[PDB]
């Protein structure tokens, strides 16, 4: 019952922003940034 409202609201908001900066590449290419936003998914799938 602490101010965990903000700590989870902002975490979901940053998850959305990290979902929107992903850039979908065809035929299974990739770039450096996409490979980083996956090393950021274990940080958003741990908190949740």
């Amino acid at each position: 019952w602490k101010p965990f409202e903000t700590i989870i609201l902002l975490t979901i908001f940053a998850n959305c922003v990290a979902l929107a900066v992903y850039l979908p590449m065809p035929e299974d290419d990739n770039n450096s940034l996409n490979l980083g936003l996956e090393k950021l998914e274990y940080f958003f799938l741990t908190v949740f």
Binding site: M25, P26, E27, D28, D29, N30
Partner: protein, 96 residues
């Protein structure tokens, strides 16, 4: 593009075309790349040497050749037929 012009306008060459066939080129730009490599091979003579390589997270030769070949009509036919058989898939790696 007339061979007398290309002949008197520069010295011979040792050209190596390096097509990028990573996944992100699929679609329009891939077919433009095929037509472009063919129209570039058409600006070579029998004094120049050529080879078409190709990379997507691993670089290999587009055809059976494996080194620089003499860019005459038969070899260029081989290299055009090999460039037309090209498909796009994988991750890009320019260093390789």
């Amino acid at each position: 593009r007339r061979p007398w012009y290309i002949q008197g306008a520069a010295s011979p060459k040792d050209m190596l075309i390096l097509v990028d066939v990573s996944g992100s080129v699929s679609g329009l730009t891939l077919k433009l790349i095929r037509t472009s490599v063919s129209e570039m091979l058409e600006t070579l003579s029998d004094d120049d040497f050529v080879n078409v390589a190709s990379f997507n997270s691993n670089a290999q030769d587009v055809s059976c050749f494996q080194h620089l070949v003499q860019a005459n009509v038969r070899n260029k036919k081989v290299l055009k037929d090999a460039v037309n058989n090209i498909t796009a898939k994988g991750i890009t790696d320019y260093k390789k």
